[PDB]
Amino acid sequence: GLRKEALEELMKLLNMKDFPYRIEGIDISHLQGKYTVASLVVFEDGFPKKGDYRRYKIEQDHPDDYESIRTVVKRRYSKHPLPNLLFVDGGIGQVNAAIEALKEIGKDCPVVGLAKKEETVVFENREIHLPHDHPVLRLLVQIRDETHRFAVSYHRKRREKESLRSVLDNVPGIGPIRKKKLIEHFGSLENIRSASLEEIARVIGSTEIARRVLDIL
């Protein structure tokens, strides 16, 4: 989680009057020819609150990350209250997009970013360049890492079937129909690795073949 200690230090650095009890963070990721997916995470008292995570889809073939951030802010905060602090995955451009959107809808909350390449902190139209091991820098990196983790999970079910298939393709002498029965039943490698020999065997009608699946898993 985010250290209460470090949350306190963050409040000082950003000159916040209020403790950052609720922090929301945004990742912007684009799927070419389809849409931008904005993934929103929530920390409450420094802990992830996974039930409150949300995504926003902005339909467009080509990325426009600043307009995407603007759209997210207007969509979300027309419905939800503002957090104590909003984190954006990026620097001056991203931070300013969020601030200007907030101004548009008559709302006000602190917005902080982390430059993508330099790990510079962006706040109130300034860069703050901290030493690498500064606790506030580490805290913001933790937020960024959770926004990324949630973002990457948009692809999960697809990625998982594909990785399951790849591992099964090294099982000698199992045909495509049985491999597909396994993929449809288990969905992923983690899932089929929690399964008994008997369970695997029942799905494909063969203990001989299920033993070999277990060998190669």
Q: Which stretch binds Cl ion (CB under 5 A): 14-22, 51-59, 128-136, 184-192?
A: 51-59
Binding positions for Cl ion, 129-148, rule CB under 5 A = 138, 141-142
- Closest alpha carbon to 25 in 71, 75, 87, 85: 87
Contact between 96 and Cl ion (CB under 5 A)? Answer: no
- The minimum distance between CB 58 and Cl ion, in angstroms, equals 15
Closest approach, Cβ 191 to Cl ion, in A, equals 19
Residues sharing a CB contact under 8 Å with residue 16, sequence separation 6 or more, in sequence order: 10, 84, 85, 110
Give the interface segment with Cl ion, choosing from 1-9, 13-21, 169-177, 192-200 (CB under 5 A).
169-177
Q: Which two tokens stand for residue 108?
A: 């006000």
For residue 203, give the H/E element and its range.
helix 197-204
Distance CA 4, CA 21 (A): 10
* H or E segment to which residue 113 belongs: strand 111-114
Query: Please, what is the minimum distance in Å from the beta carbon of residue 122 to Cl ion?
Result: 17
Residue 1 lies near Cl ion (rule: CB under 5 A): no
Breaks in the chain (C to N > 2.5 A) come right after none
Pick 148 or 202: Cβ nearer Cl ion:
148
CA separation for the pair 204, 209 (Å, rounded): 8
Q: Does 52 bind Cl ion (CB under 5 A)?
A: yes
Q: Is 165 in the site for Cl ion (CB under 5 A)?
A: no
Q: Verify binding: residue 60, Cl ion, rule CB under 5 A.
A: no
Contact present, 7 and 87 (Cβ < 8 Å): no
Q: From the CB of 80, what's the least distance to Cl ion, in Å? A: 6
Q: Does 205 bind Cl ion (CB under 5 A)?
A: no
Question: Minimum distance from CB of 3 to Cl ion (Å)?
Answer: 10
- State the residues that interact with Cl ion by CB under 5 A: 52, 54, 138, 141-142, 176
